[PDB]
Structures are given as structure tokens and as C-alpha cells.
Design a protein around this ligand. Sequence first.
Ligand SMILES: *[C@H](O)[C@H](C[C@@H]1CCNC1=O)NC(=O)[C@H](CC(C)C)NC(=O)OCc1ccccc1
Ligand SMILES: *[C@H](O)[C@H](C[C@@H]1CCNC1=O)NC(=O)[C@H](CC(C)C)NC(=O)OCc1ccccc1
Lengths: 301, 301
Amino acid sequence: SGFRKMAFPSGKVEGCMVQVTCGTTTLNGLWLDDVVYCPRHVICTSEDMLNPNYEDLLIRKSNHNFLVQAGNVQLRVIGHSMQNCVLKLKVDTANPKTPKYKFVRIQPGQTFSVLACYNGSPSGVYQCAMRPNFTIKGSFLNGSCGSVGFNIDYDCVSFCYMHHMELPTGVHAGTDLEGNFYGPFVDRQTAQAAGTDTTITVNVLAWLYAAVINGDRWFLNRFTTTLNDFNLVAMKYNYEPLTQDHVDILGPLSAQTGIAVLDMCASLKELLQNGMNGRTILGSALLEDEFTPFDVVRQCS
Amino acid sequence: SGFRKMAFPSGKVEGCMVQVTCGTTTLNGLWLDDVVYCPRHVICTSEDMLNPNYEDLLIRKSNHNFLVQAGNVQLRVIGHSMQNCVLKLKVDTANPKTPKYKFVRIQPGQTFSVLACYNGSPSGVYQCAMRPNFTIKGSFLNGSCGSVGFNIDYDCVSFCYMHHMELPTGVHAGTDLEGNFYGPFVDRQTAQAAGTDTTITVNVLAWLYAAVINGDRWFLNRFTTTLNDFNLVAMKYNYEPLTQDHVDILGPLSAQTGIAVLDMCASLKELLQNGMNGRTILGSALLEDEFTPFDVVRQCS
Ligand SMILES: *[C@H](O)[C@H](C[C@@H]1CCNC1=O)NC(=O)[C@H](CC(C)C)NC(=O)OCc1ccccc1
Ligand SMILES: *[C@H](O)[C@H](C[C@@H]1CCNC1=O)NC(=O)[C@H](CC(C)C)NC(=O)OCc1ccccc1
């Protein structure tokens, strides 16, 4: 028993983290097969980063400007190319630790594990959820760029995120492994604002089901409400509207606890209207929305 | 920027997780050099686990009763012995993934990373703090025993915990890697109650310093209080008394923020008396006490 924010084992990803150097800028890189993936702003100076012509800085570079280190072993860059916002540095050595992998792009509301890295050395691992405004609330300092987010389905690692920047609100933004940014952000140091965020409603309900599975039942009631009536209270509290699929995704959790999906929304509407009255749910005084229904089933199996 | 509950990279520990089978009971084991460490109640049936004579069940066992699997490779047990509550199964093969390690016993209030395992396969990693009553609030299902807790100082892994049981309150208990239990618990399925817990005061202050470092300053005030006057309000709210060392440990965090240690206790005493008034600190509506001053410095470096 027990429910904890739990990241995937990071061993398979640890073996692919390298250090990428260009000029006086150093960040992390992802070593898959014979290509090193890293943010393209490694080729920029502090001069360039306000409004760089990434295409212009790249032509004036060549292979020996990129110092790639896999631990203490120096990797020889035998080629370079740019895919959107990601630099692809082909190296002579095929990474022997390369796991079965996929390049996936996740949806807002889904979760993934972030392996924090600095100078090509993993520092820590934690879970993050892609916010509806395509940001994440992580822990990134200077030199953290190149650290990747990932999920594991079986023995395959589904890479889904690479860190690039931090927004003025203390939130973080990045791209998928093909260099395409999550959200309306650009890899330049200008005034960039994230859109208005909202609470992932289906995640709160799945988290409430995890509480019932673990013995937390004080918020439960006997009354119900309709899906079109619950969307009325959700629009008031900056919550996402609930769809029939979202109910179907919450199917197994509703069956394991014997609590209909719409029954839990009635408790959620009470929790939003009446507050929580200074009590806790799974050790939280707030409604948590960073646990997908899959995350609950994986822990409460 | 950003502060997140962050576990250590689990790759070095992943390479030592095995599966240990005895009869119809299967749990996890720690493969270090040529010894497999696992909880001794693997030799017990559901019959035996109420009040077992672990010394009696062990003599009636021998090597071929222990099926050890390192992935798909079967390990040959060439010997067995008991160290308190831990079974030491010597195997013929030296684990080639054995990292530099230490067998450490941690103090209540300190943190460590738990690598959740099932059938010798790592499932997830998360941080836990040893509660003052020698329990941890983790995520353990059936078959999770043998999973270890650990810290990493440099390239050395300081193993500090091995899971054994779950208490009636949903909390978990285990031993150090020498088989000595944390707290007044025994590896038998009887009525066992954890002692009354208290809030780690020095951890709350260090967590409040992490909030100031990350831009959260609404709880700050200009007034102060003495260490012997703050211990008066702490004893009221089931908080631990604060010592001069604890202030000295909070030294660097007090210097980085320019906020004296006793100044933060005044805000904490206000937060305990006046509540938080429906606002948040680092995304939390509760005062968090599972971050050591070291954990803050490591993330807010
Ligand atoms: C890459 O390692 C770095 C990660 C940042 C550092 C602070 N927090 C992070 O997540 N990214 C940048 O420095 C980035 C580079 C641009 C070319 C995209 N710029 C950036 O994040 O600017 C805003 C900022 C900088 C420093 C501290 C806080 C915010
Ligand atoms: C070992 O894998 C297992 C871990 C338990 C399973 C439930 N949560 C855990 O952390 N330990 C036991 O089953 C343990 C064995 C004794 C010989 C120490 N007994 C135990 O935890 O009993 C209480 C309990 C059992 C099942 C569910 C909840 C509590």
C-alpha cells in the first residue's frame, strides 16, 4: 500500500547521457546509436542568445568546435546537422548502452520521468506532467539543458522531452526529441509568456481513486451528478471539462473501488466548493492533478 | 530554478537487484560481489509468518531451496547464513555490476532513495525520509520486500534500508543492510504499533529556505525570536525542539538568503499559529519536513 510520486528507473537513460561542449557553453546530450542529440543553442554565445540566427551560427561552426565527452572518453564528432531545435552530432562510436527506444511526443496531461543532468552526469530523477499550457514544473539550474524526459512501457524507452529554457514564472519549456517545441516558445532569450493554465480534471479524479484504494474515504458521498452538470462547476474553478472517454479511461479505477465515475465528481465538486476543511488526502492539502489514470493503476496494482 | 522531491539516479542499484525464491515465497535481493542479501522471511510460509522461529526454519532449509535469478540467468547458491533479519546467500558468481558501496545506518530525519522492485525487476524510484518513529511513508505492495534504500555521495552507493513489512497505519518498516530493524519492530505478522511521530523541525526550516531561494517570500517577516522561545511553540504543535547544531547546519542556507535562522523560525511560528491562509509554498499547502538541509543545497546550488 501507499501512493508516492514515482519516477521510472533511470539506468537505461543514464547510459546515454553525454557532455556536449561548443565554445564556452556546455550542456548535456543524448547518445543513441551513433548520434548525439543536444539543444542547438549550445552553438550560441551569451551575445547570440537574445536573437540568434541558428542557421547562421551553424554554418560558421564545424566538427572540431564540438567537444563531446562520454564520461572521461572523448567522442569524435564526424558530422553535424540541425533538426528544428535539436543538434544531431554523428559520432564514430555506436553507444553500446543504447536501449530499445522510441521518439514519442506526449499530450498535455501526461507524465514522464526527468533525469536531471549536469556536465553529462546524472544528478537526480523525478516525475513531471506536461501542463495544459505545454510547460513543466521541474528542477533545472544552469547547465541542465540536454536532460531528457522519458517513459518506459516494457524494455523500450519512449523519449518525449529535452530541456531548453526556463520561463519567467519559474516554469520550464523544451522540445520533443525531434526538436519541435512544446508550446508557443522559441529557443531565444526574449519575453515569452506561457498561456493560462488549467487543472487536469481526469488526473484529479484518478488521484482521488488512488486515495480510496489506500484507505482515504472521508471525501466520499452518496449523491451523484451528470457529466454536463459537473462541467458547470469545473468551468468555474478553472478545471478542464470532462469527456466520455475520460470516464471510460477511469473505468477500471471505478470498478476496483465500486464507486461510479460520476459519483467521484460529486465529491470533487464538494471538494471544490466546500474546500477540504484543513484535512488531507494522501498526505496532500491540495487536489493533485499530475497523476494519470495509468500512474494510479501502475502503483495501485 | 525550481524545487522538486528528487531521487538519486538508480542505475548503479538496478544492476544489483535479483529475484530470490524459497518455496512459494518470492521477494527481491541485493547482489553485491558474491553475496545476495534478502529478507529472512523468504524462508517462511504463510503458516510460519505469525510467530516463526527463523532459526528453526533455516536449519531445515538448504541451498537448493533458494532459487536466485539475475534476470534470466539462474544463480547458484553455494552457501547461506543469517545476519539478524537478513539472509546472506553466497553465490558462485561475483556481480560484475557491483559498485563501490557502504553499509550505512541513517538517523531519523535523513532521506534516501527507494528503488521499488518486484520479482527482481525495478519498478520505480522515489525519495523517503526516515520518520522520527523509524517508519517510512513509501509505496510497497506484495512482493516488494528486498527493495533497498540508498544514497549516493560520489561514485559510492551508501545502502541504508531494506524493506520488510507494512504497518497497520499504512506505513512501512525495514532494516539496515546488516539486518538490524529501524525501530521497535519485528519481522513477524503480529500487532505492531509505531510510536507517536513528530515533525522534523530542521527540515521544515530548510524547506522554507528553498522557497525563498525560488522566489516564495510571502511568509517572511522582520521580527525574530530566541531558540528557547521557539522551542516553546514547537512543543505545542508536535514539532521537534531546535538545537544549536541544527542552526549551524542551517548556516549556509541562512547566508545565501541573508535571513538569520531565528528569523525563519519566527515565520514558522506564525505559519503554525496563523496557518497558511489558503496559500501555497513551493506548490504545497502543508509544511514539508522530508527535505534535509543537504537536499536543499543539492538542488538549490
Ligand atoms: C540550458 O541549460 C538552460 C537551462 C535553464 C537555466 C535556468 N533554468 C533553466 O532551465 N537554458 C537557458 O539558459 C536558456 C537558453 C536560451 C537560448 C533558450 N535561457 C533561459 O532559460 O533564459 C531564462 C533564464 C535564464 C537563467 C535563469 C532563469 C531563466
Ligand atoms: C514483503 O514483500 C512484504 C511487503 C508488504 C506487503 C504489503 N506492503 C508491504 O510493504 N512484507 C510482508 O508481507 C510482511 C511479512 C512479515 C513476515 C514481516 N507482512 C506484512 O507486511 O504484514 C502486514 C501486511 C500484509 C499485507 C498487506 C498489508 C499489511
